[PDB]
Amino acid sequence: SISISYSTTYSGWTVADYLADWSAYFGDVNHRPGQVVDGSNTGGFNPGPFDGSQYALKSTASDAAFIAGGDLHYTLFSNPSATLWGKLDSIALGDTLTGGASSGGYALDSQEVSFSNLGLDSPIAQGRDGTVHKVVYGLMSGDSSALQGQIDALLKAVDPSLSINSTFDQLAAAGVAHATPA
């Protein structure tokens, strides 16, 4: 089942409120035609350049960052163009991104919340409609709606009383989350 880690700072927050606020603050990096700048708003892959076990992106407007983990592939200009696909296992949110391919991986100096065992599986043929693409491109764009919807489904699968409107502490009591030190 989905497994959530959260700093105790967020114990009383709903998942939805946390994600709404986190993504709004992260803010759209404007990864769109005419506006992509390598090393500014592309993010990066480990080991890369366009594939790997992690994709990570910081907002330059500020040191808020996320890391997507799994088995990821980015098509770049190849058909279907500008598609992130593959297997998405985890999303970690926080700030102060560190590492990269030259370090052997990415990490957050302050990891606030992670969602693991997401089980998202998107074939290349689905293109930009795939769930992996929607989740991650959403986050790049300051929009956690797609992530929220996938988490909500995973929580309901455990029990229909559980949802993104549960608090992190409620989810811990329900067996799907654990707290970490603030």
- Binding residues vs ligand HEM (CB under 6 A): 31-34, 36, 38, 42-45, 50, 55, 74, 81-82, 84, 128, 133, 136-137, 140
Toward ligand HEM, which CB reaches closer, 58 or 133? 133
Please tell me whether the peptide bond between 33 and the residue prior to it is cis, using omega within 30 degrees of 0: no
Distance in angstroms (rounded) separating the CA atoms of residues 68 and 70: 7
Toward ligand HEM, which CB reaches closer, 84 or 155? 84
Q: Residue 39: which H helix or E strand, with range? A: none
Q: What's 117's DSSP letter?
A: -
Q: Tell me how many degrees the CA angle 113-141-68 measures, rounded to the nearest 5.
A: 40
Minimum gap (Å) between residue 168 Cβ and ligand HEM: 26
Contact 164, 152 (CB under 8 A): yes
Toward ligand HEM, which CB reaches closer, 68 or 164? 68
Minimum gap (Å) between residue 182 Cβ and ligand HEM: 30
Minimum gap (Å) between residue 40 Cβ and ligand HEM: 10
